[PDB]
Design a protein around this nucleic acid. Structure first.
Ligand SMILES: [Ca+2]
Ligand SMILES: [Zn+2]
Lengths: 48, 160, 400, 80, 80
DNA sequence: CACAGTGATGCAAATCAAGTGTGAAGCCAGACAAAAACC
DNA sequence: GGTTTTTGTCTGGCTTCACACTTGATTTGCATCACTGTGCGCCGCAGGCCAGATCCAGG
DNA sequence: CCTGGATCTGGCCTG
DNA sequence: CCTGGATCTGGCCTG
DNA sequence: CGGGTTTTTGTTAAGGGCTGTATCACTGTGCGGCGCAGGCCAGATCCAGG
């Protein structure tokens, strides 16, 4: 969870709309997608 | 921006009528201006003035949103024509080439400077009689000479 | 990505990458609220509708001026939608685990999932300008992770999934984001109570879910362990951190823990704290204040989050390292022979220890203890560098 | 050539990065005096540079406009 | 970049991006210290070496125990 | 009048599936025949 | 003027690729919205709990 | 019984 | 002139 | 059933160049507060020498 807190500041500054009514939705969506394991079997498919 | 912010915070408490006040009364006027400025002008209260606060604060609608808090009508007229003079004078030192973006505001900068100076000396005698901040002196005194010398000031700024 | 794609397509001709909207229309398979599922006992007080994703976290709080004022912003998934999207994400790994454990693929046994909860408040986030509520400058993140998945076969349970990096930043999945104080109780309960409702609902059901052409059934075990000590004291209804009652697992006082120091046993649980708050509130024996606090063992609030009694490991590192840091700073001054000392003597002991630690162990000094400082500090090289500054040698062998 | 967007972050080209304090004067002068020596030398000469098959000739004019009021008062030698 | 290049070359079979040793070798064309140039007259107290890149901005400030304690790190380009 | 993002939305513009039957063009054949940049 | 190169030609006939249009039916591109940050410093704090020193007024 | 200097001392200007 | 409960208070526990 | 026979595919080692991966001491997310540092200057403010 603390490493998730490290991700959260990065996703809040770099991957969100800069509006107070949109930032929590965009940050929640990106942090969902980043931890998604279907998008992680792709990046180590060179190890096949 | 910080000097106009102190002018607003000092004009709320009618310091021209009450030349003395405790620091708690200054704190009360600060909290009044801050919560009313978050309420009516969408600016959260900040500790250090940055450039975006200066860009949103130096608008005529900020004067329209602060003159509700101060009672007198002569004070409304003084603040309004003060901000009108300052916004007549800002695009000369902010424009990247002011002789080809705003020559009409450039050619009469001296008249707006003298009008701003006498409105500081007369209507705001309680603060700028015997002392004046440096950037007010630089802004009112020099910049026709600098804009004759180089050509621009906002091009030779330091934001880069 | 847009200007990378634009440059690659405008230089190399052909379109190697994909445009943005294709990524948008292919990311909806991975967000929650896409797949069909059902619960075989339908869950109490939550709809069976299966296309809800990013919903508001306030759950329709009364935002009128005539009410208790709210000022926070909260967005959350539904808990069942997040669980099904996570399981359908881990689908392929589940299949490969059932292959590699010499099981079949077409089983639909009762898969027991064991998941881990974590909640922690962040500070120094900055509210923005503009319209909206008067939002505080903190944040609370509730997130979970899927620790293991077993299945029942024969009479033994085999592990068809076990997470390799349980403390990674890639496996904790976010669930509810809000901007409120960790220690402000009321808005915290106002946001977190729907999540607890969904959890105590789905703790007694069987999720049926299609995994590659076959329906399969999952049961769940929730383990709340990713909580720091302060939040366990706050939401488990226990007292504050500096009380006479220290441990959140056993019933012992601070002076008793310095007389026995080893032999205890775990006694605190969630049902016990609930019954003890009922005892405190009802006062069914008519005792005084202090005899009642002895009777209830420090419970003075209603516990509203069920958790497992355990030990946070990271903060155990940081706390033990700061305690050893104070021991080192107290041994170079020989406080066992100077039991009285000024402020400035202790300050000078601290400055001497800081200089010698930078000279020896290449450590810059910090006021807030970290984890890397804690791992670099708890060596033998640091006790050699500190033993260089003690005059005695009995203190040397004791520290060693 | 004219810099079209002069206050960009794409055109403030870095020259020297030091881990000093601008309050400190000794280390500031010690690090910074080589660059002032080079600049003072370059103010009075010509550069020959081969630019697209042809040798061409340059000469420079350095303008120190991008200092705040505190650093100008602290460097040019005026009072605080 | 290494992750992106590696998995793109692993998926498409082709080599769309260059490996980063080729990026490093094509990087030095634009870093300082590449081109020939001639000052006219030569610059005072400036060497005529034309391959000087990232140098220590201390410029050989004496770091012994006997004299003034310096505690800064600096890196700089030669100005010309 | 700082300036390059920050992502979702929505409107416009570009491409394309399809019929079948046309035009336009490259190019095979070996050989016959002028421009031209050097001695 | 020689010498080799460099382009030109032929007509019969072969495949190869573009297009004639239209009406959805997509796919792809680009503005638009209201905001961000970099513009300054400093140190232990906050929150809470509790043994122990002050204290202050009534017997 | 000042009193004329030493000496604080809080306000103001820039980051 | 006690003197024993009010009232600070500074130090220690977690972040 | 298997010698013949034609090709496939490999090894031999001395050099070369491109690409891949290990190695090195380090990072950050673990906590909160505030106007403050530095420098200058007019206005009180104190201190002993009569
Ligand atoms: Ca935290
Ligand atoms: Zn215990």
């Amino acid at each position: 969870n603390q490493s998730g807190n490290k991700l959260f500041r990065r996703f809040r500054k770099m991957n969100a709309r800069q509006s107070k009514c949109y930032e929590m939705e965009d940050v929640l969506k990106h942090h969902w997608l980043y931890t998604s394991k279907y998008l992680q079997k792709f990046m180590n498919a060179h190890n096949a | 921006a910080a000097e106009f912010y102190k002018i607003f915070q000092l004009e709320i408490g009618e310091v021209y009528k009450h030349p003395n006040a405790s620091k708690e009364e200054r704190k009360r006027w600060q909290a009044t201006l801050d919560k009313h400025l978050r309420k009516r002008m969408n600016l959260k209260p900040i500790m250090r003035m940055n450039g975006n606060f200066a860009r949103k604060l130096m608008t005529q609608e900020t004067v329209d949103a602060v003159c509700e808090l101060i009672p007198s009508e002569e004070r409304h007229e003084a603040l309004r024509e003060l901000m009108d003079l300052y916004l007549k004078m800002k695009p000369v030192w902010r424009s990247s080439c002011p002789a080809k973006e705003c020559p009409e505001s450039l050619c009469q900068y001296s008249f707006n400077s003298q009008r701003f100076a006498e409105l500081l000396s007369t209507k705001f005698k309680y603060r700028y009689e015997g002392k004046i901040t440096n950037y007010f002196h630089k802004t009112l005194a020099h910049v026709p000479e600098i804009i004759e010398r180089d050509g621009s000031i906002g091009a030779w700024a330091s934001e880069g | 990505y847009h200007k990378m794609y634009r440059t690659v397509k405008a230089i190399t001709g052909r379109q190697i990458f994909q445009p943005l909207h294709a990524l948008r229309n292919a990311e909806k398979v991975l967000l929650p609220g896409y797949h069909p599922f059902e619960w075989q006992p339908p869950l109490k007080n939550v709809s069976s509708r299966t296309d809800v994703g990013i919903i508001d976290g306030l759950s329709g709080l009364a935002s009128s001026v005539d009410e208790y004022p709210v000022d926070t912003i909260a967005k959350r998934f539904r808990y069942d939608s997040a669980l099904v999207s996570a399981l359908m994400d881990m689908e392929e790994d589940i299949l490969e685990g059932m292959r590699s454990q010499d099981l079949d693929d077409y089983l639909n046994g009762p898969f027991t999932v064991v998941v881990k909860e974590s909640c922690d408040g962040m500070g120094d986030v900055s509210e923005k300008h503009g319209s909206g509520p008067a939002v505080p400058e903190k944040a609370v993140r509730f997130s979970f992770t899927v620790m293991r998945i077993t299945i029942e076969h024969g009479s033994q349970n085999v592990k068809v999934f076990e997470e390799p990096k349980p403390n990674s930043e890639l496996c904790c999945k976010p669930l509810c984001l809000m901007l409120a104080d960790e220690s402000d109780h009321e808005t915290l309960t106002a946001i977190l109570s729907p999540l607890i409702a969904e959890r105590e609902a789905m703790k007694s059901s069987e999720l049926t879910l299609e995994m590659g052409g076959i329906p399969r059934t999952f049961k769940f075990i929730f383990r709340g362990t990713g909580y720091d000590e302060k939040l366990v004291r706050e939401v488990e209804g226990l007292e504050a951190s500096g009380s006479v009652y220290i441990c959140t697992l056993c019933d012992t006082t601070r002076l008793e823990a310095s007389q026995n120091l080893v032999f205890h046993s775990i006694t605190r649980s969630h049902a016990e704290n609930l019954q003890r708050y009922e005892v405190w509130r009802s006062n069914p024996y008519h005792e005084s204040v202090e005899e009642l606090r002895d009777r209830v063992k420090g419970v003075s609030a209603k516990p509203f989050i069920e958790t497992v009694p355990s030990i946070d490991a990271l903060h155990c590192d940081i706390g033990n390292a700061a305690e050893f840091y104070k021991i080192f700073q107290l041994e170079i001054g020989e406080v066992y022979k100077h039991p009285n000392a000024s402020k400035e003597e202790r300050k000078r002991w601290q400055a001497t220890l800081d200089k010698h630690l930078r000279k020896r162990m290449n450590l810059k000094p910090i006021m807030r203890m970290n984890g890397n400082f804690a791992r670099k500090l708890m060596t033998q090289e640091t006790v050699d560098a500190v033993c260089e500054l003690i005059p005695s040698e009995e203190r040397h062998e004791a520290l060693r």
